[PDB]
Design a protein around this ligand. Sequence first.
Ligand SMILES: CCNCc1cn(CC(=O)Nc2sc3c(c2C(N)=O)CCCC3)nc1C(F)(F)F
Ligand SMILES: N[C@@H](CCC(=O)O)C(=O)O
Ligand SMILES: N[C@@H](CCC(=O)O)C(=O)O
Lengths: 261, 261
Amino acid sequence: ANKTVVVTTILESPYVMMKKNHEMLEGNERYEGYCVDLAAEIAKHCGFKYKLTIVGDGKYGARDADTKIWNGMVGELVYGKADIAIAPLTITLVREEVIDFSKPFMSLGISIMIKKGTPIESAEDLSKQTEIAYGTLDSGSTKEFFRRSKIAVFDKMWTYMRSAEPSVFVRTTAEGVARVRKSKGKYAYLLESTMNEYIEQRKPCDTMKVGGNLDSKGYGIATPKGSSLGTPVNLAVLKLSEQGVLDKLKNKWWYDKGECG
Amino acid sequence: ANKTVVVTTILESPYVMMKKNHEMLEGNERYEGYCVDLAAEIAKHCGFKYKLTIVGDGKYGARDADTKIWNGMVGELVYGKADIAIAPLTITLVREEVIDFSKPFMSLGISIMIKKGTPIESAEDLSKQTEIAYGTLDSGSTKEFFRRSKIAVFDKMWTYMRSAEPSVFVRTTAEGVARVRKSKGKYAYLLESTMNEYIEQRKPCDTMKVGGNLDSKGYGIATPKGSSLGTPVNLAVLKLSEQGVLDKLKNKWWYDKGECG
Ligand SMILES: CCNCc1cn(CC(=O)Nc2sc3c(c2C(N)=O)CCCC3)nc1C(F)(F)F
Ligand SMILES: N[C@@H](CCC(=O)O)C(=O)O
Ligand SMILES: N[C@@H](CCC(=O)O)C(=O)O
């Protein structure tokens, strides 16, 4: 019998953002963004009621090599704290084994963010020099991509990054963006193209995406392995895609939100 | 107990192509291309033996509105003639209901092919004029996209296309490409970006992709609903993606095959 779905998500612009007057608001009304709108459309199309909740540790999901314990939104699904994750959650082999993922609702690749005027055009450029530091988010698919890569240029990037001092790794996207902005061109941030493209068009308009994408992948809606929600959630994603709704929401939250001309 | 997998596919460059000396060859050796190489890697990674076979009717898959019968590669899976489809087979809602699809191994969008010098930059351009004819492949996801679209510009394109005389629809990609080349700029062909991008770089180098993509989707490996092959095939796709193998094969069959500079 039908009950209220607990949705795990993460504060990540423009996907889930606190409204500025959130202290004045209750429940799902506290939040706005692409994944908030998507949650509403999916809920509507699968006939369910839901509660948005921000993941407590503020992480996406990785497994600890010692304890084998999952953190982040992945751990919330794995250990039964949440029924579904609606977020910019990257589809990976390691995750697909422990949770179910819908077909992708958005595509992306790993990309490079620089302070405007930084003399770097590509990951090759980054790997061949030392003056400009570079790093990635902690507990995410981007860090794992570099850690497990056996491709020469990325292997070389990873060997640098893992022992660089001070740490090149950051805990949130906001913190990586802040570091690019405040490091006067001496730090480049490796992040997903979708996030990069949003920030590029936000004030103070001082960052830039450079070079091709390093890989090719997608975000999926994630459910615990074998949940009854998996099948209808997947069909809702395909239907919304085909109805043009996913493209409408991308325009709403990227193009319409552009503050840089 | 483990037996030889029947793989359904379609002749579509650069995915599956007859080797020029195919009369001299037997079995899987008759064929080359991206999907031939992918079939070999997936077979290797799931521990199975396989037989490549070209779909008899030469179609992708649509359901007849009268009889409700599926044709093409989709029908081969649905009616049990094949065990798996390894091809440029687009993930759609209607198909996902009757077959299982792996996560996407390649991304694409609907795009516009013109003879070089054709005064058309976009689907809006196409929809606002009459001198230049335009159409799509029969029995495919592109025709259905336009047929079912309620988006103004594509609705308008579809109303034209469905009653245009002579027919704007073609039976194979080769035939749509031939029509662009031989119609002196008076026909534009609507096809998937991946196919477009390949042809653009092939002699006689007289076509061109123009405008943004009309939509966003992917190709998946397809199995009959509930096949034991679904789960290991999906994990092989993610692993190959992550190992960089899918990117290596894209370069092999697109960039390395470029004859246009
Ligand atoms: C129904 C919404 N359609 C969006 C969509 C976008 N794609 C393609 C895509 O997002 N690309 C992905 S995602 C991804 C991979 C790849 C790839 N190699 O191209 C490899 C590893 C696993 C995750 N496909 C679709 C859709 F949903 F039709 F299938
Ligand atoms: N979307 C990523 C987080 C961002 C990143 O790693 O760059 C994940 O699911 O882990
Ligand atoms: N890949 C398409 C065929 C090509 C097209 O429709 O443009 C399909 O699966 O139907």
